[PDB]
Amino acid sequence: AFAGVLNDADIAAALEACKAADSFNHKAFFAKVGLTSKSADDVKKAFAIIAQDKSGFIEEDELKLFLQNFKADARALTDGETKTFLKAGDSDGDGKIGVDEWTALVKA
Ligand SMILES: [Ca+2]
Ligand SMILES: [Ca+2]
16 A cells, blocks of 8 residues: 555565564664655655544554555554554544654654
């Protein structure tokens, strides 16, 4: 779903690095996959994908499936990984990650 925004090479290496359960770190994934250097238009396309439906937010259960947006058969994040990722992104603490949070998080 990221064809045209992120290259396959980086996506391959990013998934590879966080292979073992609990090895995931969103900041490392962002950097390796090439997200932090993308335009505002691509960063919003990325949000629309990860957020799945049209609730306008990345709900926790959606976050858990973060890696699958890149590779269909990727593993789901662990409860631990999901919580760490959510905690760092959910600035307003409403339990989910909205667009502003996403934009900001990608800039941190
Ligand atoms: Ca959603
Ligand atoms: Ca939030």
